[PDB]
Amino acid sequence: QNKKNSITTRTLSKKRAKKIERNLKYATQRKLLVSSLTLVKEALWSVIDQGTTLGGPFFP
Amino acid sequence: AKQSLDVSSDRRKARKAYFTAPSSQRRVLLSAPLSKELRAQYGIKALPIRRDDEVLVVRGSKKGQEGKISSVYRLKFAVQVDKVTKEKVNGASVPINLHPSKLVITKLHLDKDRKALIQRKGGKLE
Amino acid sequence: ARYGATSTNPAKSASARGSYLRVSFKNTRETAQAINGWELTKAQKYLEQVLDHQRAIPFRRFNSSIGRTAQGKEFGVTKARWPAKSVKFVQGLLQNAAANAEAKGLDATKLYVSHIQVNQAPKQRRRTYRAHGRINKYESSPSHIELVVTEKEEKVVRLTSRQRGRIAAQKRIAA
Amino acid sequence: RSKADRMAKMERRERNRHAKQGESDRHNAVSLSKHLFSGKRGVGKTDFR
Amino acid sequence: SEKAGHQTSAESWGTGRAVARIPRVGGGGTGRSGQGAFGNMCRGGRMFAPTK
RNA sequence: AUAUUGGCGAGAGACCGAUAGCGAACAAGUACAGUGAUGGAAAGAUGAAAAGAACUUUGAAAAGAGAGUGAAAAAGUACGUGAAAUUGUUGAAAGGGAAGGGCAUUUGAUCAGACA
RNA sequence: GUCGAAUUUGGGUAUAGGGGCGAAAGACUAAUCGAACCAUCUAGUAGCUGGUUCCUGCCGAAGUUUCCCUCAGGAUAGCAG
RNA sequence: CGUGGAGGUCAGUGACGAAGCCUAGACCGUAAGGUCGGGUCGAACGGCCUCUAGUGCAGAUCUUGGUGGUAGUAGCAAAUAUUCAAAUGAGAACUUUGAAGACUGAAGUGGGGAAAGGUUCCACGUCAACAGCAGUUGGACGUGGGUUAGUCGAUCCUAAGA
Ligand SMILES: [Mg+2]
Ligand SMILES: [Mg+2]
Ligand SMILES: [Mg+2]
Ligand SMILES: [Mg+2]
Ligand SMILES: [Mg+2]
Ligand SMILES: [Mg+2]
Ligand SMILES: [Mg+2]
Ligand SMILES: [Mg+2]
Ligand SMILES: [Mg+2]
Ligand SMILES: [Mg+2]
Ligand SMILES: [Mg+2]
Ligand SMILES: [Mg+2]
Ligand SMILES: [Mg+2]
Ligand SMILES: [Mg+2]
Ligand SMILES: [Mg+2]
Ligand SMILES: [Mg+2]
Ligand SMILES: [Mg+2]
Ligand SMILES: [Mg+2]
Ligand SMILES: [Mg+2]
């Protein structure tokens, strides 16, 4: 019913839903046979990896 | 099968010794095998892990990643690699606890004692 | 998570709960049953009137040796009370459920209490010293409360050959 | 500091449910009291009034 | 162990005490005080016909 | 050559598996009781990894609702599984001073086999 | 009731269990006194009460005889295999 | 018929889900019981031939633990007695100040000590539990501060006695 898409006591857990999806993939295979912090750190690593004369010979 | 009367096959005794092993014994318990290149170069198969050597992860969800050993947490029977971590939204980084039997040493940290250990294990360094 | 009952289409519902609340389980059950099924705003105004002692909470199950009052005639009973502590806890949960519905975007004028459930929390076990050097129990009965509010929204017959023949004959005989 | 505070607050819950005065309240009650369960009342002196 | 279930100071409270006549631990100030003892049907008692 | 429920060091079992096994698997001869001699418990299990719920919102706060971590929160430091007694809610049914049981069938609900 | 003494009371000290102490009540000796409390021998002694855990099939009793003087506790005969 | 453990075997079952538990579903046994489906669960378990035993519960005023009805009931009625405004606070019958009314009535509900207790004294912070209502308050919880001797005692002397 959720794939197709009051008060009830009938609920489906995530653990059971994941097992159902896994077993459906198994059956389908048989039927066919027959992070912002990471991005910031990466950018930082990628970005880090005459002349002039003032004054003169005197004591001001 | 065992033959010596001084060795025990008792599961309870073996597990007790493992979990109560002191730090000097845990050093030997936390041994990591060498890479194929280092095995050919030196002639030995495994060494105790230490702080400043490079490793490759060959098992688990972090397989294929490399880095330097950040620390050897002997208290929790684990090693920590600087490159291998877990990140949160708030900027938190938590080190991944890795077991050295699931790693491969790619570059040894060489000192006088390490060279002597390789030589007495039967190595041919340089 | 793990409510006693959940709503189908959770995009039209909001939930609230409170656990290990130091309030009487029996009085709280009576208050929740008085609220069960009402519109949210009407329920809140009714609880305000109960605090003001203008209306009463009918006591139906846990009611042995209770006084009688004229304010129970609205609900067709004689035994009703005004449990202020239970009303305050339920009012807090109602306000929280309204806030959650508002955050979800539901219409506040169409919300009704579609589920409310009170069960017993683990007991708070004080003891009292009594005559002849006895120790007797002296316990609090706390409550777990939960509620869900909801937006209100507005054959082949097999016959025998005899039956088929009768129907066909009636059809031929009639128009 | 806040993590340690939360750990202590979670740890306190069973003792608080048992209504102890604190971590120092370790009163123990006997299973049965002999002075309450040691009675055969003859025609004479009793253990209580 | 031949001492298992026997390292207890306990005695019966007698007939007519409105409780069963199994021996009970004396003393006070601990939850053990007043509990049944020595019996094969008692928690912490001696097993029937202990293995030799 | 013989003895050895103490001490020290070892190896084992058709033994017990947290109401069992030593009283004690855990800061156990502890906590607690008694003037004292002495008496004497209860108490093991999140997760592979604390990654132990950041952040928004309601609330004085505990907390709740979104969100997130995680294979799983039908693992949230009340934490593996999670029985019964007893309880709440929902749906169905019965009820003129007990209920329960047996034989038989009606009614309502529900369901398997057999379909060449 | 008694209330200036055979008075009331604190502290120290002495007397210890088949013992003490007693203006004598088997009173009191740490809520314990016709025998204090604690540990052990010790799982002490049973003429007696209570309880004693799965199924089915087949067979299936016994108060009636003589005795240890008679009660008590035992023997024997019969009945079922 | 059933249970724990043991030797042998089924190259037995199992992360495409072991054991356990729940079940308005299905089947086989006269029965003890056995088998299958669904849900939950998350790592081990069974058939057969034999061995072995701490092997089957409704009762024992049984043992330990847990839970009901009683029941929001009995009751929280000794010690004459409390009221107003402000402040604080989310919240004040119960906290603080002020305003009132009372009481102990010097053989005190005052001021000090002995035995005993051991920090309860005082300050700051502060309400999960406790104070049989409440609580912002506390002899509670958290962190600290505080006990100054030639002259006050012990110490010395001896009493009954040891
Ligand atoms: Mg009444
Ligand atoms: Mg008393
Ligand atoms: Mg035992
Ligand atoms: Mg034990
Ligand atoms: Mg659980
Ligand atoms: Mg049940
Ligand atoms: Mg006495
Ligand atoms: Mg399974
Ligand atoms: Mg047995
Ligand atoms: Mg039973
Ligand atoms: Mg029976
Ligand atoms: Mg009973
Ligand atoms: Mg009343
Ligand atoms: Mg009064
Ligand atoms: Mg007066
Ligand atoms: Mg006066
Ligand atoms: Mg109170
Ligand atoms: Mg003070
Ligand atoms: Mg303090």
DSSP D1-49: -HHHHHHHHHHTHHHHHTT-SSTT------SS-TTTS-----SS--S--
| In contact, E31 and E24? CB cutoff 8 Å | no
Cα–Cα distances in angstroms (integers) from residue B62 to residues B6, B30, B66, C109, in the given order = 41, 19, 9, 53
Place of tokens 């208290």: B75
CA C75 – CA C58 distance, rounded (Å)? 7
Resolution (Å units): 2.3
C-alpha–C-alpha distance, residues D43 and D30, integer Å: 30
Helix/strand/coil for B49: coil
Q: How far apart are CA C68 and CA C81, in angstroms?
A: 9
Span from the CA of C145 to the centroid of ligand 4 (angstroms): 39
d(CA B53, CA B34): 11
Residues B38 and B45: beta-carbon distance below 8 Å: no
Answer for D2: CB within 7 Å of strand H.
no
User: Is the torsion defined by CA of C98, C99, C104, C107 positive or negative?
Assistant: positive
DSSP H or E segment with residue C125: strand C124-130
Method: cryo-EM
| Identity of the residue in D19, D29, D36 whose CB atom sits nearest the CB atom of C132 | D36
Cβ atoms of C6 and A7 within 8 Å: the answer is yes
β-pairing, B66-73 with B78-81?
antiparallel
- Give CA separation, C94 vs C75, C88, C111, in Å: 22, 10, 11
- On chain B, the residues whose CB falls within 8 A of the CB of A36 are 89
* DSSP 3-state of A20: helix
* Nearest bound ligand to the CA of residue D19: 17
Interface test with E, best of D26, D31, D47 (most E CBs within 10 A): D31
Across D20-33, b (16+ Cβ under 10 Å) vs e yields: eeeeeeeeeebebb
CB-based contact C91:C47 (threshold 8 Å): yes
From residue C100, alpha-carbon distances to C3, C95, C97, C103, E42 in Å are: 16, 9, 5, 5, 55
Give the other-Cβ count within 10 Å of D36's Cβ: 15
Domain boundaries, chain B: 1-126
Amino acid at E43: R
B85 touches B94 (CB < 8 A)? yes
**Cα C3 to Cα C37, C117, D48, distances in angstroms:** 17, 9, 54
D10: CB within 7 A of chain F nucleic strand: yes
Q: CB of D47 within 8 A of CB of C153?
A: no
For residue C85, the CA-to-ligand 14 centroid distance in Å is: 29
C34 CB-contact burial (10 Å; exposed 0-12 / middle 13-18 / buried 19+): buried
Amino acid at E18: A
Helix H or strand E segment including E52: none
CA-to-CA separations, B16 to B1, B13, B101, E51, in angstroms, rounded:
21, 5, 20, 29
Which tokens is B104 given?
């491969």
**How far is E20 from E36, CA to CA, in rounded Å?**
9
CA distance B74 to B57: 19
E23 C-beta neighbours (distance < 10 Å), count: 18
User: Any chain A CB within 8 A of the CB of B96?
Assistant: no
Task: Tokens for E42, please give them.
Answer: 């008692």
**CB B95, CB B81: distance < 8 Å:** yes
Q: Where are the alpha helices (DSSP H) in chain C?
A: 25-35, 40-51, 84-104, 161-173
Residues 6-35 on chain E lying near strand H, CB distance under 7 A: 15-22, 31, 34-35
Find, among B58, B80, B84, B59, the residue nearest to B70 by Cα.
B80
Please give the C-alpha separations between residue D8 and each of B83, C37, D17, D18, in angstroms, as whole numbers: 34, 41, 15, 16
Distance from CA of D26 to the nearest CA of C (A): 14
- Among residues C73, C32, C80, which one has the least CA distance to residue C56? C80
Asked if residues C165 and C49 have their Cβ atoms less than 8 Å apart, the reply is no
The C-alpha atoms of residue C126 and residue C66 are separated, in whole angstroms, by 26
Residues of chain C in contact with residue D36, where contact means CB-CB under 8 angstroms, are: 132-134
Q: What residue in D sits closest to E20 (Cα-Cα)?
A: D37
Structure tokens that stand for C69 in this block: 């009052």
Give the span between the Cα atoms of B74 and A2, in whole angstroms: 49
Residue whose entry in the numeric block shows the structure tokens 């949160």: B88
* Among candidates D29, D30, D37 on the partner chain, residue whose Cβ is nearest the Cβ of E19: D37
Q: B40: part of which helix (H) or strand (E)? A: helix B36-42
CB contact under 8 A, E13 and D38: yes
Domain B1-126: state its class: mainly beta
Cα B91 to Cα A39, C82, D1, distances in angstroms: 11, 52, 19
| Stretch (H or E) spanning B93 | strand B93-95
Region of residue E24 (left: phi > 0; alpha: psi -120 to 50; beta: else): beta
Q: Which position has the token pair 């009012």?
A: C91
Q: Count Cβ atoms below 10 Å from residue C31 Cβ, excluding itself.
A: 29
d(CA B60, CA B58): 7
